[PDB]
Design an enzyme around this catalytic site. Structure first.
Site, PDB file in Angstrom:
ATOM      1  N   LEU A 162       0.859  -1.215   0.000  1.00 51.26           N
ATOM      2  CA  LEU A 162       0.000   0.000   0.000  1.00 51.26           C
ATOM      3  C   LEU A 162       0.888   1.256   0.000  1.00 51.26           C
ATOM      4  O   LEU A 162       0.354   2.351  -0.249  1.00 51.26           O
ATOM      5  CB  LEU A 162      -0.914  -0.036   1.235  1.00 51.26           C
ATOM      6  CG  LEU A 162      -1.792  -1.279   1.382  1.00 51.26           C
ATOM      7  CD1 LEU A 162      -2.453  -1.340   2.753  1.00 51.26           C
ATOM      8  CD2 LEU A 162      -2.839  -1.326   0.283  1.00 51.26           C
ATOM      9  N   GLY A 171       8.220   3.665   1.244  1.00 50.52           N
ATOM     10  CA  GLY A 171       8.978   4.926   1.411  1.00 50.52           C
ATOM     11  C   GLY A 171      10.241   4.762   2.253  1.00 50.52           C
ATOM     12  O   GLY A 171      10.703   3.611   2.418  1.00 50.52           O
ATOM     13  N   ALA A 172      10.791   5.878   2.750  1.00 49.41           N
ATOM     14  CA  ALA A 172      11.993   5.940   3.618  1.00 49.41           C
ATOM     15  C   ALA A 172      11.730   5.136   4.897  1.00 49.41           C
ATOM     16  O   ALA A 172      12.509   4.207   5.184  1.00 49.41           O
ATOM     17  CB  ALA A 172      12.346   7.375   3.931  1.00 49.41           C
ATOM     18  N   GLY A 211      10.192   2.448   6.044  1.00 52.05           N
ATOM     19  CA  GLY A 211       9.723   1.060   5.848  1.00 52.05           C
ATOM     20  C   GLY A 211       8.739   0.902   4.696  1.00 52.05           C
ATOM     21  O   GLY A 211       8.852   1.653   3.713  1.00 52.05           O
ATOM     22  N   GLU A 212       7.837  -0.085   4.805  1.00 52.76           N
ATOM     23  CA  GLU A 212       6.720  -0.358   3.854  1.00 52.76           C
ATOM     24  C   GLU A 212       5.405  -0.516   4.632  1.00 52.76           C
ATOM     25  O   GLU A 212       5.433  -0.852   5.829  1.00 52.76           O
ATOM     26  CB  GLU A 212       6.995  -1.609   3.014  1.00 52.76           C
ATOM     27  N   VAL A 213       4.286  -0.234   3.981  1.00 52.22           N
ATOM     28  CA  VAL A 213       2.934  -0.461   4.552  1.00 52.22           C
ATOM     29  C   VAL A 213       2.316  -1.593   3.739  1.00 52.22           C
ATOM     30  O   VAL A 213       2.358  -1.491   2.492  1.00 52.22           O
ATOM     31  CB  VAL A 213       2.069   0.818   4.545  1.00 52.22           C
ATOM     32  CG1 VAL A 213       0.606   0.496   4.808  1.00 52.22           C
ATOM     33  CG2 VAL A 213       2.573   1.829   5.569  1.00 52.22           C
ATOM     34  N   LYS A 221       2.463  -1.390   9.147  1.00 53.10           N
ATOM     35  CA  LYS A 221       3.718  -0.666   8.838  1.00 53.10           C
ATOM     36  C   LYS A 221       4.883  -1.506   9.369  1.00 53.10           C
ATOM     37  O   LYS A 221       4.869  -1.870  10.550  1.00 53.10           O
ATOM     38  CB  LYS A 221       3.720   0.756   9.407  1.00 53.10           C
ATOM     39  CG  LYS A 221       4.978   1.560   9.102  1.00 53.10           C
ATOM     40  CD  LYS A 221       5.108   2.800   9.963  1.00 53.10           C
ATOM     41  CE  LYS A 221       6.309   3.650   9.615  1.00 53.10           C
ATOM     42  NZ  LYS A 221       6.138   5.029  10.124  1.00 53.10           N
ATOM     43  N   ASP A 229       3.138  17.184   8.700  1.00 50.73           N
ATOM     44  CA  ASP A 229       3.311  16.870   7.251  1.00 50.73           C
ATOM     45  C   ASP A 229       1.969  16.610   6.587  1.00 50.73           C
ATOM     46  O   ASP A 229       1.780  15.561   5.902  1.00 50.73           O
ATOM     47  CB  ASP A 229       4.287  15.704   7.076  1.00 50.73           C
ATOM     48  CG  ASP A 229       4.954  15.632   5.701  1.00 50.73           C
ATOM     49  OD1 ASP A 229       4.983  16.638   4.937  1.00 50.73           O
ATOM     50  OD2 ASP A 229       5.404  14.528   5.364  1.00 50.73           O
TER      51      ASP A 229
HETATM   52  N1  LIG Z   1      -0.849   3.543   3.360  1.00 49.31           N
HETATM   53  C1  LIG Z   1      -1.991   3.099   3.850  1.00 49.31           C
HETATM   54  N2  LIG Z   1      -2.910   2.577   3.014  1.00 49.31           N
HETATM   55  C2  LIG Z   1      -4.087   2.137   3.499  1.00 49.31           C
HETATM   56  N3  LIG Z   1      -4.381   2.166   4.799  1.00 49.31           N
HETATM   57  C3  LIG Z   1      -3.460   2.630   5.654  1.00 49.31           C
HETATM   58  N4  LIG Z   1      -3.487   2.814   7.000  1.00 49.31           N
HETATM   59  C4  LIG Z   1      -2.295   3.346   7.386  1.00 49.31           C
HETATM   60  N5  LIG Z   1      -1.539   3.543   6.322  1.00 49.31           N
HETATM   61  C5  LIG Z   1      -2.261   3.117   5.222  1.00 49.31           C
END
Ligand SMILES: Nc1ncnc2[nH]cnc12
Ligand SMILES: [Cl-]
Length: 259
Positions: free
Chosen positions: A12, A15-16, A18-20, A35, A119
């Site tokens: 999803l 970035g810097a 980690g990953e989601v 995360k 941000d």
């Molecule tokens: N990047 C993301 N995409 C969808 N749901 C999330 N909840 C927290 N981060 C999210």
């Protein structure tokens, strides 16, 4: 890949920090967001555990497994506000107003618990399956009020096109007017599909044009007079003369009934 009962099924965000991942519980079929950080985080988790509001991403809990931290959060399956903004166009004014109402409800909530996001931008404003806005990503968030005592900020952070001018010019500044400014740049992006300036500096011609009120230029000429009068109160260079959220809530456009 998997963590206890959860499978990590698709990216999803990458970035810097980690990953989601979309995480689906193999048993229950519950979908969440996870995360993943390959180990600052102590603080982010402390802040995440404070968050309880319909327009802020909820924190479910975390797991350490060796050098990898897993932060479990509410899923927003609608993507980001960024994906609802048509370049050079924006979006219909009533959809912009609704998102702006939700964004103000989230920011009032955060400010009320003494948290600044630092941000705010369309990539950090996620949508649920009912197009409800969720303020996400507390990796730069910080405490600006504790035991009813305000502390000024000094760290420069955020995203240049969204940052308030005091953050480039002052050694220390108030947290709340910086978040209000960024909400003004988000409102501009929603109504015009374009950012007004690279950064709010004296050396930035588009910023000077705004200070000289050249609203016959883009992006301002695409924005109706009512929302544009609100943007005149938000994007005020002096943070002590900038409109506060209590006063945004009395604005003519803020209270205008729309399609
Ligand atoms: N990047 C993301 N995409 C969808 N749901 C999330 N909840 C927290 N981060 C999210
Ligand atoms: Cl944009």
């Amino acid at each position: 890949p998997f963590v206890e009962d959860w499978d990590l099924v698709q990216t999803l965000g990458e970035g810097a920090y980690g990953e989601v991942q979309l995480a689906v519980n193999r048993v229950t079929e519950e979908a969440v967001a996870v995360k993943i950080v390959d180990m600052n985080i102590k603080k982010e988790i402390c802040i995440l555990k404070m968050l309880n509001h319909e327009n802020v991403i909820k924190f479910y809990g975390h797991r350490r497994e060796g050098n990898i931290q897993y932060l479990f959060m509410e899923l927003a399956s609608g993507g980001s506000l960024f994906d609802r903004i048509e370049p050079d166009i924006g979006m219909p004014e009533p959809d912009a107003q609704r998102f702006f109402h939700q964004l103000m409800a989230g920011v009032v909530y955060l400010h009320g618990i003494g948290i600044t996001h630092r941000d705010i931008k369309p990539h950090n404003l996620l949508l649920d399956e009912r197009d409800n806005l969720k303020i996400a990503d507390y990796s730069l968030a910080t405490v600006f009020r504790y035991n009813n005592r305000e502390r000024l900020l000094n760290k420069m952070c955020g995203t240049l096109p969204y940052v308030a001018p005091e953050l480039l010019k002052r050694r220390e500044f108030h947290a709340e007017p910086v978040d209000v400014w960024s909400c003004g740049i988000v409102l501009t992006a929603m109504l015009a599909g374009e950012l007004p300036w690279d950064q709010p500096s004296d050396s930035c011609q588009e910023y000077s044009d705004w200070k000289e009120k050249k609203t016959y230029l883009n992006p301002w000429k695409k924005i109706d007079s009512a929302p544009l009068a609100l943007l005149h109160k938000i994007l005020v260079e002096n943070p002590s003369a900038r409109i506060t959220i209590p006063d945004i809530k009395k604005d003519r456009w803020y209270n205008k009934p729309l399609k």
